[PDB]
From a paper:
We report here structure-function studies of soluble periplasmic LT of Campylobacter jejuni. The LT Cj0843 was identified from a virulent strain of C. jejuni and localized in the periplasm. The LT enzymes cleave the PG MurNAc-GlcNAc glycosidic bond similar to lysozyme with the noted difference that LTs have an additional (2nd) cyclization step; this step requires a boat conformation of MurNAc leading to a 1,6-anhydromuramyl product as the predominant terminal saccharide moiety. The crystal structure of the soluble LT Cj0843 from C. jejuni revealed an unusual doughnut-shaped structure containing four domains: NU-, U-, L-, and C-domains.
The structures from both crystal forms are very similar with a root-mean-square-deviation (RMSD) for 509 Cα atoms of 0.75 Å. At the N-terminus is a small helical domain (NU-domain) connected via a flexible linker to the helical U-domain. This flexible linker (residues 75–83) is partially resolved in the P3121 crystal form and fully resolved in the I23 crystal form; it spans 22Å between ordered anchor points I74 and Y84 in the NU-domain and U-domain, respectively. The central pore of the ‘doughnut’ is elliptical and has an inner diameter ranging from 16 to 37Å. The most prominent feature of the electrostatic potential surface of Cj0843 is its predominantly positively charged inner ring surface. The outer ring surface of these ring-shaped proteins shows a more random distribution of positive, negative, and neutral residues.
Residue numbers in the entry: 19 to 76, 81 to 532
The structure:
């Protein structure tokens, strides 16, 4: 470990945060050591904040305004009332006499506040706001209570997409399968009124009610408006699944984006496999330390700051086997993510696993870390396979009994791949398909089991398994699974062990 004073020398980074956090969680930082530690934390969110505030606890314009309570709010001036009435919890806490008075007071200057004040006099504030078609109020109330749910007319639902909250509202209720009356109402949104992710989710919604022509119209709108080729491909795939137009399949097979949809279309049209870059430096190693987390943070900052000529210079400093992940990382930026980099670094460590397992390990590592051995996430997951300290210590200390085990052993590629394999043996025994294994690797076996036990997920159906892949209940896991699955297909191909993509999808249907 590093002493608190040595850490304070280091530049501020997620690595420095992580080591500060290691000392805090062991109670190794004294009260004076802890004093200026606020300024030595790169990202002062989550576990590290909570832990520092056990030692060091934390706008004068409005200090006066928080002296007032529900009982004294009418004594406050207009500015203080305004500030306090930003909270719906606070509005709900008032009595109806005072809400009625405040409603009259704010009628001209804050009419949206008036609507909410009056809404909270009724037993269903959402019904009141819906009657008004007060869109700002609608989203405030949804954020206040996710339980409100009622039928919304065509006029109202077609106004909802003109609010920045709509996208995540729509996504959340669709993938969580909540607010049935809201979901059903959104069938009357005109595709003309939505674009990108909103249009896409409304497509998925329409598919869950078996409105296939409506779904096509939403997916087509998404395909025309998405800015990223990867999302375009996902929308075009749905246009093809619904109407079977050959030109959509062909456009999809010709995509510059390497993803499961474009790969699947290439298979279906006998289009060749995409070109994968082949990187194999002659030099085995240099003086750069790939196990030093601070050195990576420093060189990452320099790479992220660099122009074309500077990236070319940096590439030549890292053209070695041992530094291949940094080299590939530099080159991925130098070609603006246009070429396809699927490296297989520290391969001697996995060569004795069978090729299917190698492909899965590589697929997960590429997604988790791009193979950077000292990768540290915002939750302090570590190394190429991004093990959380809890799991790393459980495997290293309890189950495997490794002498002198520290969780920083995760920065060693030999350990990362070994623990990766170990954890994959456990997941794959229960879950079978590499897609389901990916979901559990990212989101835990618990949520993955609860999901697969549902009678509406990954069962036989017209648009399965593709519909279920859009309804994974966590946005992060949905995306993760698709990316890892694409990576898995590519690594199977690179290992002269190609898999038929159609086979993979057929196996998802339980």
């Amino acid at each position: 470990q590093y002493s608190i004073e040595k850490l304070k020398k280091e530049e501020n980074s997620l690595a420095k945060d992580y080591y500060i956090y290691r000392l805090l969680e062991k109670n190794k930082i004294s009260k004076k050591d802890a004093q200026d530690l606020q300024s030595h934390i790169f990202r002062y969110i989550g576990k590290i904040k909570s832990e520092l505030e056990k030692i060091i606890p934390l706008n004068p314009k409005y200090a006066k305004c928080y002296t007032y309570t529900a009982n004294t709010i009418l004594d406050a001036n207009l500015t203080c009332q305004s500030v306090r009435l930003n909270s719906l919890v606070f509005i709900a806490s008032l009595n109806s006499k005072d809400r009625t008075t405040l409603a009259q007071t704010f009628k001209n200057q804050r009419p949206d506040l008036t609507n909410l004040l009056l809404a909270f006099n009724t037993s269903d504030p959402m019904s009141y706001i819906v009657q008004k078609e007060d869109i700002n109020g609608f989203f405030k109330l949804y954020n206040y209570s996710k339980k409100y749910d009622l039928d919304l007319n065509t006029s109202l639902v077609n106004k909802l997409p003109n609010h920045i909250g709509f996208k995540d509202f729509a996504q959340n209720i669709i993938i969580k399968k909540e607010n049935p009356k809201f979901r059903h109402s959104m069938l009357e949104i005109n595709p003309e009124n939505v674009s990108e992710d909103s249009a896409f989710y409304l497509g998925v919604n329409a598919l869950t009610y078996d409105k296939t022509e409506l779904a096509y119209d939403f997916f087509k709108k998404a395909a025309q408006s998405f800015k990223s080729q990867s999302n375009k491909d996902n929308a075009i795939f749905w246009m093809w699944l619904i109407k079977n137009n050959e030109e959509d399949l062909k456009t999809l097979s010709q995509s510059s984006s390497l993803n499961i949809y474009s790969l699947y279309a290439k298979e279906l049209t006998n289009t060749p496999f995409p070109k994968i870059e082949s990187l194999n430096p002659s030099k085995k190693k240099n003086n750069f330390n790939m196990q030093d987390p601070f050195a990576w943070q420093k060189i990452n900052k320099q790479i992220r700051d660099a122009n074309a000529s500077q990236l070319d210079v940096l590439a030549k400093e890292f053209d070695t086997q041992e530094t291949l992940p940094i080299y590939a990382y530099i080159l991925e930026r130098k070609n603006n993510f246009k070429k396809h980099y699927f490296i297989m670094p520290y391969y001697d460590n996995i060569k004795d696993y069978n090729k299917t397992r190698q492909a899965l390990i590589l697929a997960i590592a590429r997604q988790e870390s791009r193979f950077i051995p000292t990768a540290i996430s915002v939750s302090y997951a570590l190394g190429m396979m991004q093990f959380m300290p809890f799991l790393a210590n459980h495997i290293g200390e309890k189950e495997l009994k490794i002498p002198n085990f520290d969780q920083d052993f995760m920065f060693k590629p030999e350990i990362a791949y070994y623990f990766g394999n170990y954890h994959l043996n456990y997941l794959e025994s229960r879950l079978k398909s590499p897609l389901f294994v990916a979901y559990a690797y990212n989101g835990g076996i618990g949520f993955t089991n609860r999901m697969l036990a549902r009678n509406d997920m990954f069962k036989t159906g017209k648009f399965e398994p593709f519909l279920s892949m859009e309804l994974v209940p966590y946005q992060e896991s949905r995306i993760y699974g698709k990316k890892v699955l694409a990576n898995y297909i590519v690594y199977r191909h690179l290992l002269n062990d190609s898999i038929k993509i159609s086979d993979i999808f057929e196996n998802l249907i339980q």
